[PDB]
Design a protein around this ligand. Structure first.
Ligand SMILES: Cc1cn([C@H]2C[C@H](OP(=O)(O)O)[C@@H](COP(=O)(O)O)O2)c(=O)[nH]c1=O
Ligand SMILES: [Ca+2]
Length: 130
């Protein structure tokens, strides 16, 4: 079963990538199951600002690795991030600032939760879906 672990914010990079201090080591983390646009693309700045605000204003930040691989080929930690108990991955998708993507079996525990959030954002024609 999955478990949440403490992590400290170093710096928000963009919508789905952040630098955190995990177990005393500075690491770049990439959010599982989602894809925010590049800062240079439509809604890119919006997604960056959303994530930045959410992580910087948080009292507690936690990371939750899935059951599979914990890092990607670029050395980035792969996890679900929580800001005061609220999952950032889900928040972005629910806001239509990120699409469900890179769904790989083994690291897809929250796939249904995220797809539900995407469907609602799409139904509401929010941002990316506008
Ligand atoms: C989210 C995620 C991304 N990735 C890789 C796939 C993509 O590789 P390629 O760059 O070779 O396409 C890249 C997408 O990241 P970004 O969306 O940050 O660019 O990160 C994984 O391997 N596993 C994951 O769980
Ligand atoms: Ca991206």
């Amino acid at each position: 079963k999955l478990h949440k672990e403490p992590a400290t914010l170093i710096k928000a990079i963009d919508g789905d990538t952040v630098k955190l201090m995990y177990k005393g080591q500075p690491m770049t983390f990439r959010l599982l199951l989602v894809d925010t646009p590049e800062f240079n693309e439509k809604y890119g700045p919006e997604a960056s600002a959303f994530t930045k605000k959410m992580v910087e204003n948080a009292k507690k930040i936690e990371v939750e690795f899935d059951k599979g691989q914990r890092t990607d080929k670029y050395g980035r930690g792969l996890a679900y991030k929580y800001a005061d108990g609220k999952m950032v991955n889900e928040a972005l998708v629910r806001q239509g600032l990120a699409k469900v993507a890179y769904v790989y079996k083994g690291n897809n525990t929250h796939e249904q939760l995220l797809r539900k959030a995407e469907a609602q954002a799409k139904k509401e024609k929010l941002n990316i879906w506008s």
